[PDB]
Protein backbone atom coordinates (compact mmCIF):
# COMPACT_ATOMS: atom_id res chain seq x y z
CA UNK A 1 0.00 0.00 0.00
CA UNK A 2 3.09 2.20 0.25
CA UNK A 3 3.41 2.37 -3.55
CA UNK A 4 -0.28 3.26 -3.88
CA UNK A 5 0.10 5.93 -1.18
CA UNK A 6 3.13 7.40 -2.98
CA UNK A 7 1.23 7.38 -6.29
CA UNK A 8 -1.74 9.14 -4.67
CA UNK A 9 0.56 11.71 -3.06
CA UNK A 10 2.29 12.39 -6.38
CA UNK A 11 -1.09 12.67 -8.12
CA UNK A 12 -2.52 15.14 -5.59
CA UNK A 13 0.68 17.21 -5.55
CA UNK A 14 0.71 17.38 -9.36
CA UNK A 15 -2.95 18.43 -9.11
CA UNK A 16 -1.85 21.16 -6.68
CA UNK A 17 0.79 22.26 -9.21
CA UNK A 18 -1.85 22.33 -11.96
CA UNK A 19 -4.22 24.35 -9.77
CA UNK A 20 -1.43 26.79 -8.87
CA UNK A 21 -0.49 27.37 -12.51
CA UNK A 22 -4.18 27.63 -13.47
CA UNK A 23 -4.83 30.30 -10.83
CA UNK A 24 -1.52 31.96 -11.76
CA UNK A 25 -2.84 32.88 -15.24
CA UNK A 26 -4.58 36.20 -14.69
CA UNK A 27 -4.69 36.94 -18.43
CA UNK A 28 -3.84 35.41 -21.80
CA UNK A 29 -1.42 36.66 -24.43
CA UNK A 30 -4.11 37.01 -27.12
CA UNK A 31 -6.05 39.78 -25.38
CA UNK A 32 -2.83 41.71 -24.78
CA UNK A 33 -1.62 41.16 -28.35
CA UNK A 34 -4.88 42.07 -30.13
CA UNK A 35 -4.21 45.86 -30.10
CA UNK A 36 -0.79 46.01 -31.82
CA UNK A 37 0.21 46.52 -35.43
CA UNK A 38 0.45 43.19 -37.30
CA UNK A 39 3.41 41.93 -39.27
CA UNK A 40 2.98 42.09 -43.03
CA UNK A 41 3.60 39.32 -45.53
CA UNK A 42 7.15 37.97 -45.29
CA UNK A 43 7.77 37.52 -49.02
CA UNK A 44 11.26 36.11 -48.46
CA UNK A 45 12.79 34.95 -51.73
CA UNK A 46 15.67 32.50 -51.74
CA UNK A 47 19.23 33.79 -51.89
CA UNK A 48 21.57 30.79 -51.61
CA UNK A 49 20.90 27.12 -52.38
CA UNK A 50 23.86 25.18 -50.98
CA UNK A 51 23.91 22.38 -53.53
CA UNK A 52 26.49 19.63 -53.17
CA UNK A 53 24.93 17.11 -50.82
CA UNK A 54 24.19 13.72 -52.36
CA UNK A 55 21.94 12.42 -49.57
CA UNK A 56 19.27 13.39 -47.06
CA UNK A 57 20.14 16.40 -44.87
CA UNK A 58 18.91 16.27 -41.27
CA UNK A 59 20.69 18.94 -39.21
CA UNK A 60 22.40 22.31 -39.46
CA UNK A 61 23.86 24.87 -37.07
CA UNK A 62 25.31 28.36 -37.43
CA UNK A 63 28.10 30.09 -35.55
CA UNK A 64 28.09 33.28 -33.53
CA UNK A 65 28.34 35.04 -36.90
CA UNK A 66 26.99 34.20 -40.35
CA UNK A 67 29.01 32.96 -43.37
CA UNK A 68 29.81 29.66 -41.64
CA UNK A 69 27.43 26.77 -41.00
CA UNK A 70 27.78 23.00 -40.70
CA UNK A 71 25.53 20.45 -42.39
CA UNK A 72 24.91 16.78 -41.65
CA UNK A 73 23.69 14.12 -44.06
CA UNK A 74 23.75 10.34 -44.43
CA UNK A 75 26.46 10.43 -47.14
CA UNK A 76 29.09 10.37 -44.38
CA UNK A 77 30.07 13.98 -45.17
CA UNK A 78 29.89 16.89 -42.72
CA UNK A 79 30.22 19.91 -45.01
CA UNK A 80 31.20 23.30 -43.60
CA UNK A 81 29.75 25.89 -45.97
CA UNK A 82 30.86 29.39 -46.81
CA UNK A 83 27.37 30.85 -46.86
CA UNK A 84 27.89 34.12 -48.75
CA UNK A 85 30.07 32.74 -51.54
CA UNK A 86 28.04 29.44 -51.60
CA UNK A 87 31.45 27.71 -51.23
CA UNK A 88 32.42 24.92 -48.84
CA UNK A 89 35.50 25.04 -46.62
CA UNK A 90 35.80 21.48 -45.29
CA UNK A 91 34.24 18.11 -46.16
CA UNK A 92 34.60 16.06 -42.97
CA UNK A 93 34.27 12.28 -43.40
CA UNK A 94 32.36 10.32 -40.77
CA UNK A 95 33.17 6.90 -39.34
CA UNK A 96 29.42 6.21 -39.15
CA UNK A 97 27.04 7.15 -41.96
CA UNK A 98 24.07 7.51 -39.57
CA UNK A 99 23.92 11.18 -38.59
CA UNK A 100 20.96 13.29 -37.49
CA UNK A 101 22.67 15.90 -35.29
CA UNK A 102 25.44 18.43 -35.81
CA UNK A 103 26.48 21.68 -34.19
CA UNK A 104 28.96 24.50 -34.72
CA UNK A 105 30.65 25.74 -31.57
CA UNK A 106 30.56 29.47 -30.72
CA UNK A 107 34.37 29.50 -30.81
CA UNK A 108 34.25 27.84 -34.24
CA UNK A 109 36.97 25.33 -33.34
CA UNK A 110 34.84 22.21 -32.71
CA UNK A 111 31.83 20.59 -34.36
CA UNK A 112 29.33 17.97 -33.25
CA UNK A 113 28.38 14.75 -35.01
CA UNK A 114 26.17 11.93 -33.81
CA UNK A 115 23.27 9.71 -34.72
CA UNK A 116 22.27 6.06 -34.54
CA UNK A 117 25.86 5.00 -33.81
CA UNK A 118 25.35 6.14 -30.17
CA UNK A 119 28.69 8.02 -30.22
CA UNK A 120 29.24 11.78 -30.26
CA UNK A 121 31.99 12.93 -32.61
CA UNK A 122 33.99 16.11 -31.98
CA UNK A 123 36.42 17.30 -34.66
CA UNK A 124 39.16 19.94 -34.35
CA UNK A 125 38.71 22.34 -37.27
CA UNK A 126 41.90 24.35 -36.59
CA UNK A 127 45.03 22.19 -36.52
CA UNK A 128 48.70 22.82 -37.33
CA UNK A 129 48.52 19.77 -39.58
CA UNK A 130 46.31 20.66 -42.51
CA UNK A 131 43.21 18.47 -42.17
CA UNK A 132 40.10 17.95 -40.03
CA UNK A 133 40.84 15.45 -37.26
CA UNK A 134 38.63 13.97 -34.55
CA UNK A 135 39.66 14.98 -31.02
CA UNK A 136 37.36 13.21 -28.53
CA UNK A 137 35.19 10.15 -29.23
CA UNK A 138 32.33 10.67 -26.78
CA UNK A 139 30.55 7.41 -25.92
CA UNK A 140 28.45 6.32 -22.97
CA UNK A 141 24.95 6.62 -24.39
CA UNK A 142 23.04 3.39 -24.94
CA UNK A 143 20.60 5.13 -27.31
CA UNK A 144 20.93 7.24 -30.43
CA UNK A 145 22.07 10.83 -30.08
CA UNK A 146 19.69 13.41 -31.51
CA UNK A 147 20.81 16.93 -30.54
CA UNK A 148 24.32 18.03 -29.59
CA UNK A 149 24.21 21.77 -28.92
CA UNK A 150 27.49 23.24 -27.60
CA UNK A 151 27.87 25.08 -24.31
CA UNK A 152 31.37 26.39 -25.07
CA UNK A 153 34.75 25.18 -26.35
CA UNK A 154 35.06 22.57 -23.58
CA UNK A 155 31.48 21.63 -22.58
CA UNK A 156 29.05 19.78 -24.85
CA UNK A 157 25.39 18.97 -24.16
CA UNK A 158 24.09 15.85 -25.90
CA UNK A 159 20.48 14.72 -26.20
CA UNK A 160 20.35 10.94 -26.50
CA UNK A 161 18.13 7.92 -27.10
CA UNK A 162 18.27 6.44 -23.60
CA UNK A 163 15.87 9.25 -22.50
CA UNK A 164 18.70 11.13 -20.74
CA UNK A 165 20.56 14.34 -21.52
CA UNK A 166 24.26 14.61 -20.74
CA UNK A 167 26.99 17.22 -20.31
CA UNK A 168 30.48 16.04 -21.22
CA UNK A 169 34.11 17.12 -21.03
CA UNK A 170 36.31 17.18 -24.13
CA UNK A 171 39.59 16.44 -22.32
CA UNK A 172 38.27 13.40 -20.39
CA UNK A 173 35.24 12.13 -22.30
CA UNK A 174 33.13 11.46 -19.20
CA UNK A 175 29.71 12.87 -18.36
CA UNK A 176 29.88 15.49 -15.62
CA UNK A 177 26.12 15.25 -15.08
CA UNK A 178 23.35 13.00 -16.36
CA UNK A 179 19.95 14.68 -16.72
CA UNK A 180 17.31 12.10 -15.84
CA UNK A 181 13.53 12.33 -15.67
CA UNK A 182 12.28 12.08 -19.24
CA UNK A 183 10.07 9.02 -19.56
CA UNK A 184 9.85 9.13 -23.36
CA UNK A 185 12.60 9.25 -25.95
CA UNK A 186 14.32 12.61 -26.38
CA UNK A 187 15.06 14.40 -29.66
CA UNK A 188 15.02 18.08 -28.67
CA UNK A 189 17.67 20.28 -27.05
CA UNK A 190 18.13 24.04 -26.85
CA UNK A 191 20.51 26.01 -24.64
CA UNK A 192 19.72 29.34 -23.06
CA UNK A 193 21.50 32.43 -24.46
CA UNK A 194 23.04 33.18 -21.04
CA UNK A 195 24.49 29.61 -21.01
CA UNK A 196 23.04 28.71 -17.63
CA UNK A 197 19.96 26.55 -18.33
CA UNK A 198 18.52 24.44 -21.12
CA UNK A 199 15.21 22.93 -22.11
CA UNK A 200 14.65 19.57 -23.74
CA UNK A 201 11.60 17.97 -25.34
CA UNK A 202 10.79 14.26 -25.33
CA UNK A 203 8.22 11.78 -26.65
CA UNK A 204 5.96 12.14 -23.59
CA UNK A 205 5.00 15.72 -24.64
CA UNK A 206 7.22 17.05 -21.83
CA UNK A 207 9.53 20.07 -21.88
CA UNK A 208 11.90 20.04 -18.90
CA UNK A 209 14.08 22.89 -17.66
CA UNK A 210 17.49 21.80 -16.42
CA UNK A 211 20.36 23.58 -14.68
CA UNK A 212 23.81 22.65 -15.93
CA UNK A 213 25.93 23.30 -12.82
CA UNK A 214 24.10 20.83 -10.57
CA UNK A 215 21.86 18.82 -12.86
CA UNK A 216 18.20 18.49 -11.90
CA UNK A 217 14.87 19.29 -13.54
CA UNK A 218 13.61 22.64 -12.27
CA UNK A 219 10.27 22.83 -14.11
CA UNK A 220 8.26 20.68 -16.49
CA UNK A 221 5.08 21.23 -18.47
CA UNK A 222 2.89 19.08 -20.71
CA UNK A 223 0.71 20.88 -23.23
CA UNK A 224 1.37 18.82 -26.33
CA UNK A 225 -0.18 15.48 -27.25
CA UNK A 226 2.41 14.02 -29.63
CA UNK A 227 6.16 13.59 -30.02
CA UNK A 228 8.17 16.79 -29.52
CA UNK A 229 11.02 17.05 -32.01
CA UNK A 230 11.72 20.81 -32.21
CA UNK A 231 12.67 23.15 -29.36
CA UNK A 232 14.27 26.60 -29.11
CA UNK A 233 14.47 29.39 -26.56
CA UNK A 234 13.00 32.80 -27.13
CA UNK A 235 15.92 35.21 -27.74
CA UNK A 236 15.18 37.02 -24.47
CA UNK A 237 15.78 33.77 -22.56
CA UNK A 238 12.55 33.89 -20.53
CA UNK A 239 10.46 31.85 -22.98
CA UNK A 240 10.79 28.94 -25.38
CA UNK A 241 8.65 27.67 -28.26
CA UNK A 242 7.99 23.99 -28.89
CA UNK A 243 7.58 22.25 -32.24
CA UNK A 244 6.08 18.77 -32.17
CA UNK A 245 4.74 16.08 -34.48
CA UNK A 246 1.20 17.31 -33.90
CA UNK A 247 0.75 20.01 -36.61
CA UNK A 248 0.99 22.68 -33.91
CA UNK A 249 3.62 24.91 -32.31
CA UNK A 250 3.33 25.95 -28.66
CA UNK A 251 5.04 28.70 -26.66
CA UNK A 252 6.05 28.28 -23.02
CA UNK A 253 7.74 30.67 -20.61
CA UNK A 254 10.50 30.01 -18.10
CA UNK A 255 8.72 31.97 -15.36
CA UNK A 256 5.25 30.39 -15.23
CA UNK A 257 5.65 27.32 -17.52
CA UNK A 258 2.17 27.50 -19.04
CA UNK A 259 0.50 27.55 -22.45
CA UNK A 260 1.11 31.09 -23.68
CA UNK A 261 0.12 30.57 -27.32
CA UNK A 262 -0.54 27.75 -29.77
CA UNK A 263 0.32 27.94 -33.48
CA UNK A 264 -2.02 25.55 -35.29
CA UNK A 265 -3.93 25.92 -38.55
CA UNK A 266 -6.59 23.83 -40.27
CA UNK A 267 -4.83 23.57 -43.64
CA UNK A 268 -1.74 21.93 -42.08
CA UNK A 269 -1.97 18.40 -40.66
CA UNK A 270 1.70 17.52 -41.12
CA UNK A 271 4.32 17.53 -38.41
CA UNK A 272 7.01 20.06 -37.56
CA UNK A 273 10.66 19.05 -37.85
CA UNK A 274 12.40 22.23 -36.67
CA UNK A 275 11.54 25.55 -35.02
CA UNK A 276 13.81 28.55 -34.46
CA UNK A 277 13.50 32.26 -33.65
CA UNK A 278 14.94 35.40 -35.15
CA UNK A 279 16.87 37.76 -32.90
CA UNK A 280 13.85 40.00 -32.30
CA UNK A 281 11.52 37.14 -31.38
CA UNK A 282 8.56 38.58 -33.30
CA UNK A 283 8.68 35.95 -36.06
CA UNK A 284 8.59 32.22 -35.31
CA UNK A 285 9.82 29.98 -38.12
CA UNK A 286 8.23 26.52 -38.17
CA UNK A 287 9.34 23.78 -40.51
CA UNK A 288 6.76 21.37 -41.84
CA UNK A 289 6.33 18.01 -43.54
CA UNK A 290 4.19 19.77 -46.18
CA UNK A 291 7.38 20.15 -48.28
CA UNK A 292 7.78 23.81 -47.28
CA UNK A 293 8.50 26.17 -44.39
CA UNK A 294 6.07 28.53 -42.69
CA UNK A 295 6.70 31.58 -40.50
CA UNK A 296 4.49 32.59 -37.58
CA UNK A 297 3.68 35.66 -35.54
CA UNK A 298 5.07 34.76 -32.13
CA UNK A 299 2.44 37.04 -30.55
CA UNK A 300 -0.47 37.22 -33.01
CA UNK A 301 -0.30 33.49 -33.95
CA UNK A 302 -0.95 34.20 -37.64
CA UNK A 303 0.80 33.04 -40.80
CA UNK A 304 3.12 35.84 -41.91
CA UNK A 305 4.37 34.04 -45.02
CA UNK A 306 5.31 30.70 -46.56
CA UNK A 307 8.84 29.79 -47.62
CA UNK A 308 7.66 27.22 -50.15
CA UNK A 309 10.15 25.85 -52.63
CA UNK A 310 11.60 22.66 -51.17
CA UNK A 311 11.18 19.52 -53.25
CA UNK A 312 10.94 17.40 -50.07
CA UNK A 313 10.18 17.56 -46.34
CA UNK A 314 12.32 19.97 -44.33
CA UNK A 315 14.30 18.72 -41.34
CA UNK A 316 16.33 21.67 -39.99
CA UNK A 317 16.29 25.47 -40.06
CA UNK A 318 18.38 28.04 -38.24
CA UNK A 319 18.21 31.82 -38.12
CA UNK A 320 21.58 33.47 -37.58
CA UNK A 321 22.54 35.09 -34.28
CA UNK A 322 22.47 38.57 -35.87
CA UNK A 323 19.00 37.89 -37.29
CA UNK A 324 20.39 37.98 -40.82
CA UNK A 325 19.06 34.93 -42.65
CA UNK A 326 17.53 31.48 -42.16
CA UNK A 327 18.95 28.31 -43.72
CA UNK A 328 16.21 25.68 -44.06
CA UNK A 329 17.61 22.22 -44.71
CA UNK A 330 15.49 19.45 -46.14
CA UNK A 331 15.48 15.84 -47.30
CA UNK A 332 16.08 16.69 -50.98
CA UNK A 333 19.83 17.37 -50.43
CA UNK A 334 19.18 21.12 -50.57
CA UNK A 335 19.81 23.92 -48.10
CA UNK A 336 18.04 27.14 -49.10
CA UNK A 337 18.90 30.47 -47.48
CA UNK A 338 16.06 32.98 -47.24
CA UNK A 339 15.99 36.73 -46.65
Amino acid sequence: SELDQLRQEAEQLKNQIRDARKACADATLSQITNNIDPVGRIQMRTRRTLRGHLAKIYAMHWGTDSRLLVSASQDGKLIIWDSYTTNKVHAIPLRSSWVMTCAYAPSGNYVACGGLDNICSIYNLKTREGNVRVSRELAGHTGYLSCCRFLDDNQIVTSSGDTTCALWDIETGQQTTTFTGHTGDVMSLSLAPDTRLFVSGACDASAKLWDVREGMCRQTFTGHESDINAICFFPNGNAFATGSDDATCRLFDLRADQELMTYSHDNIICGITSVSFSKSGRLLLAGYDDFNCNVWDALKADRAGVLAGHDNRVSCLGVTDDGMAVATGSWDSFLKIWN
Binding site: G52, Q74, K77, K88, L116
Partner: protein, 223 residues
Protein backbone atom coordinates in the same frame (compact mmCIF):
# COMPACT_ATOMS: atom_id res chain seq x y z
CA UNK B 1 38.40 38.73 -57.92
CA UNK B 2 40.88 38.48 -55.05
CA UNK B 3 43.50 35.74 -55.13
CA UNK B 4 42.38 34.31 -51.78
CA UNK B 5 38.80 34.09 -53.04
CA UNK B 6 39.99 32.32 -56.21
CA UNK B 7 42.01 29.89 -54.08
CA UNK B 8 38.93 29.22 -51.93
CA UNK B 9 36.84 28.64 -55.07
CA UNK B 10 39.46 26.24 -56.45
CA UNK B 11 39.59 24.34 -53.14
CA UNK B 12 35.77 24.16 -53.10
CA UNK B 13 35.76 22.76 -56.65
CA UNK B 14 38.47 20.23 -55.74
CA UNK B 15 36.57 18.98 -52.70
CA UNK B 16 33.33 18.91 -54.71
CA UNK B 17 35.11 16.66 -57.22
CA UNK B 18 36.40 14.49 -54.36
CA UNK B 19 32.90 14.31 -52.85
CA UNK B 20 31.44 13.38 -56.25
CA UNK B 21 33.98 10.60 -56.82
CA UNK B 22 33.45 9.35 -53.25
CA UNK B 23 29.64 9.43 -53.43
CA UNK B 24 29.40 7.90 -56.90
CA UNK B 25 30.45 4.57 -55.37
CA UNK B 26 27.62 4.81 -52.82
CA UNK B 27 25.19 3.78 -55.57
CA UNK B 28 27.32 0.70 -56.28
CA UNK B 29 27.56 0.02 -52.53
CA UNK B 30 24.15 -1.59 -52.17
CA UNK B 31 22.72 -1.73 -48.65
CA UNK B 32 20.40 -4.05 -46.72
CA UNK B 33 18.31 -3.60 -43.57
CA UNK B 34 18.95 -6.71 -41.47
CA UNK B 35 16.59 -6.94 -38.51
CA UNK B 36 14.90 -9.63 -36.48
CA UNK B 37 13.95 -10.92 -33.07
CA UNK B 38 16.53 -11.59 -30.38
CA UNK B 39 18.35 -14.96 -30.55
CA UNK B 40 16.16 -15.82 -33.57
CA UNK B 41 19.04 -17.00 -35.77
CA UNK B 42 20.11 -13.47 -36.67
CA UNK B 43 23.58 -13.98 -35.19
CA UNK B 44 24.47 -16.94 -37.42
CA UNK B 45 23.31 -15.33 -40.68
CA UNK B 46 25.99 -12.61 -40.66
CA UNK B 47 28.84 -15.13 -40.93
CA UNK B 48 27.79 -15.74 -44.55
CA UNK B 49 32.46 -1.10 -29.67
CA UNK B 50 29.62 1.23 -30.66
CA UNK B 51 26.59 -0.51 -29.03
CA UNK B 52 24.44 0.56 -31.97
CA UNK B 53 24.08 -0.41 -35.61
CA UNK B 54 26.69 -3.04 -36.46
CA UNK B 55 28.21 -2.55 -39.92
CA UNK B 56 29.17 -5.62 -41.95
CA UNK B 57 30.79 -5.16 -45.37
CA UNK B 58 30.59 -8.16 -47.70
CA UNK B 59 30.23 -8.76 -51.42
CA UNK B 60 29.03 -11.47 -53.78
CA UNK B 61 29.61 -11.37 -57.56
CA UNK B 62 30.86 -7.75 -57.31
CA UNK B 63 27.89 -6.01 -55.69
CA UNK B 64 29.21 -4.81 -52.26
CA UNK B 65 26.29 -5.41 -49.91
CA UNK B 66 25.95 -3.57 -46.61
CA UNK B 67 23.92 -4.91 -43.68
CA UNK B 68 22.66 -2.70 -40.84
CA UNK B 69 21.98 -4.96 -37.87
CA UNK B 70 19.90 -2.91 -35.44
CA UNK B 71 20.19 -5.45 -32.62
CA UNK B 72 21.89 -3.06 -30.19
CA UNK B 73 19.41 -0.17 -30.65
CA UNK B 74 17.07 -0.22 -27.64
CA UNK B 75 15.35 3.08 -28.50
CA UNK B 76 11.96 3.68 -30.12
CA UNK B 77 12.01 2.25 -33.65
CA UNK B 78 9.47 4.69 -35.13
CA UNK B 79 11.71 7.77 -34.99
CA UNK B 80 14.81 6.29 -36.66
CA UNK B 81 13.17 4.10 -39.31
CA UNK B 82 12.94 7.07 -41.70
CA UNK B 83 16.72 7.01 -42.22
CA UNK B 84 16.34 3.82 -44.31
CA UNK B 85 14.50 5.06 -47.38
CA UNK B 86 17.63 4.41 -49.45
CA UNK B 87 17.78 0.76 -48.43
CA UNK B 88 17.01 -1.66 -51.24
CA UNK B 89 15.63 -4.65 -49.28
CA UNK B 90 14.70 -5.80 -45.78
CA UNK B 91 16.20 -8.99 -44.33
CA UNK B 92 13.89 -10.51 -41.71
CA UNK B 93 15.62 -13.43 -39.97
CA UNK B 94 13.24 -15.36 -37.72
CA UNK B 95 13.49 -18.91 -36.38
CA UNK B 96 10.97 -21.66 -37.02
CA UNK B 97 11.86 -23.52 -33.81
CA UNK B 98 10.58 -20.62 -31.66
CA UNK B 99 6.89 -21.47 -32.02
CA UNK B 100 6.27 -23.32 -28.74
CA UNK B 101 8.52 -21.68 -26.13
CA UNK B 102 7.36 -18.22 -25.07
CA UNK B 103 10.38 -16.63 -23.32
CA UNK B 104 12.23 -19.54 -21.57
CA UNK B 105 12.17 -17.31 -18.46
CA UNK B 106 8.57 -16.05 -18.16
CA UNK B 107 5.09 -16.82 -19.51
CA UNK B 108 3.26 -13.86 -21.05
CA UNK B 109 3.71 -13.98 -24.86
CA UNK B 110 5.09 -16.33 -27.50
CA UNK B 111 8.13 -15.33 -29.54
CA UNK B 112 6.34 -16.16 -32.80
CA UNK B 113 3.47 -13.78 -32.05
CA UNK B 114 5.90 -10.93 -31.32
CA UNK B 115 7.74 -11.78 -34.55
CA UNK B 116 4.45 -11.65 -36.47
CA UNK B 117 3.64 -8.27 -34.90
CA UNK B 118 7.11 -6.97 -35.79
CA UNK B 119 6.71 -8.17 -39.38
CA UNK B 120 3.31 -6.49 -39.66
CA UNK B 121 4.82 -3.28 -38.27
CA UNK B 122 7.85 -3.27 -40.57
CA UNK B 123 5.91 -4.46 -43.65
CA UNK B 124 3.10 -1.88 -43.51
CA UNK B 125 5.34 1.13 -42.87
CA UNK B 126 4.66 4.11 -45.13
CA UNK B 127 8.44 4.35 -45.61
CA UNK B 128 8.60 0.87 -47.16
CA UNK B 129 5.90 0.92 -49.83
CA UNK B 130 8.33 -0.43 -52.44
CA UNK B 131 11.08 -2.16 -50.43
CA UNK B 132 11.00 -5.89 -51.12
CA UNK B 133 11.35 -8.03 -47.99
CA UNK B 134 13.83 -10.90 -48.06
CA UNK B 135 12.18 -12.99 -45.36
CA UNK B 136 14.50 -15.65 -43.94
CA UNK B 137 13.48 -18.74 -41.96
CA UNK B 138 16.54 -20.31 -40.36
CA UNK B 139 17.52 -23.16 -37.96
CA UNK B 140 15.22 -25.72 -39.55
CA UNK B 141 17.42 -28.47 -38.06
CA UNK B 142 16.10 -27.90 -34.54
CA UNK B 143 12.58 -27.67 -36.00
CA UNK B 144 12.80 -31.22 -37.40
CA UNK B 145 12.65 -32.97 -34.02
CA UNK B 146 10.75 -30.21 -32.18
CA UNK B 147 7.71 -30.77 -34.41
CA UNK B 148 7.53 -34.54 -33.76
CA UNK B 149 6.51 -34.07 -30.11
CA UNK B 150 4.92 -30.62 -29.82
CA UNK B 151 2.13 -29.84 -32.33
CA UNK B 152 1.15 -26.36 -33.52
CA UNK B 153 -1.70 -26.21 -30.97
CA UNK B 154 0.66 -24.54 -28.49
CA UNK B 155 1.25 -21.70 -30.97
CA UNK B 156 -1.99 -21.76 -32.99
CA UNK B 157 -5.27 -23.38 -31.80
CA UNK B 158 -6.65 -22.83 -35.30
CA UNK B 159 -4.29 -25.08 -37.31
CA UNK B 160 -6.50 -28.21 -37.66
CA UNK B 161 -4.20 -29.79 -40.24
CA UNK B 162 -1.45 -32.42 -40.21
CA UNK B 163 1.25 -32.41 -37.53
CA UNK B 164 4.07 -32.77 -40.04
CA UNK B 165 7.14 -30.77 -41.02
CA UNK B 166 6.17 -29.72 -44.55
CA UNK B 167 2.66 -28.56 -43.66
CA UNK B 168 4.00 -26.68 -40.62
CA UNK B 169 6.57 -24.85 -42.76
CA UNK B 170 3.91 -24.13 -45.39
CA UNK B 171 1.49 -22.77 -42.79
CA UNK B 172 4.15 -20.50 -41.29
CA UNK B 173 4.88 -19.38 -44.87
CA UNK B 174 1.17 -18.70 -45.42
CA UNK B 175 0.87 -16.68 -42.21
CA UNK B 176 3.92 -14.58 -43.07
CA UNK B 177 2.96 -13.93 -46.70
CA UNK B 178 -0.59 -12.85 -45.83
CA UNK B 179 0.81 -10.22 -43.44
CA UNK B 180 1.59 -8.12 -46.54
CA UNK B 181 -1.41 -5.87 -47.17
CA UNK B 182 -0.40 -4.80 -50.70
CA UNK B 183 0.96 -7.62 -52.86
CA UNK B 184 1.12 -5.57 -56.08
CA UNK B 185 4.11 -3.27 -55.51
CA UNK B 186 5.54 -5.40 -52.68
CA UNK B 187 7.05 -8.87 -53.08
CA UNK B 188 8.31 -10.92 -50.13
CA UNK B 189 11.14 -13.36 -50.82
CA UNK B 190 11.47 -16.37 -48.52
CA UNK B 191 14.32 -18.86 -48.21
CA UNK B 192 14.56 -22.05 -46.16
CA UNK B 193 17.91 -22.45 -44.44
CA UNK B 194 19.62 -23.98 -41.41
CA UNK B 195 22.37 -22.87 -39.05
CA UNK B 196 24.91 -24.83 -41.14
CA UNK B 197 23.38 -24.24 -44.58
CA UNK B 198 24.95 -22.43 -47.52
CA UNK B 199 23.37 -20.71 -50.56
CA UNK B 200 21.95 -17.74 -48.67
CA UNK B 201 24.28 -15.42 -50.59
CA UNK B 202 22.72 -16.70 -53.84
CA UNK B 203 19.22 -15.93 -52.55
CA UNK B 204 20.14 -12.43 -51.41
CA UNK B 205 22.05 -11.80 -54.66
CA UNK B 206 19.00 -12.82 -56.71
CA UNK B 207 16.91 -10.57 -54.47
CA UNK B 208 19.10 -7.49 -54.87
CA UNK B 209 19.47 -8.05 -58.62
CA UNK B 210 15.68 -8.23 -59.04
CA UNK B 211 15.18 -5.05 -57.00
CA UNK B 212 17.78 -3.17 -59.04
CA UNK B 213 16.13 -4.41 -62.24
CA UNK B 214 12.97 -2.79 -60.87
CA UNK B 215 15.04 0.36 -60.25
CA UNK B 216 16.43 0.30 -63.80
CA UNK B 217 12.92 0.04 -65.22
CA UNK B 218 11.87 2.88 -62.90
CA UNK B 219 14.52 5.45 -63.83
CA UNK B 220 14.36 4.62 -67.55
CA UNK B 221 10.61 5.29 -67.38
CA UNK B 222 8.83 1.96 -67.92
CA UNK B 223 7.81 0.50 -64.54
Amino acid sequence: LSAEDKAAVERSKMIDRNLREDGEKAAREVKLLLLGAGESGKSTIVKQKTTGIVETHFTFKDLHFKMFDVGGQRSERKKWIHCFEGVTAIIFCVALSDYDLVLAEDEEMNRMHESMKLFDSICNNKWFTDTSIILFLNKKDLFEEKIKKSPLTICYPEYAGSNTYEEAAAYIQCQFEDLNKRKDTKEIYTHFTCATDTKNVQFVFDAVTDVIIKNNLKDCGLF
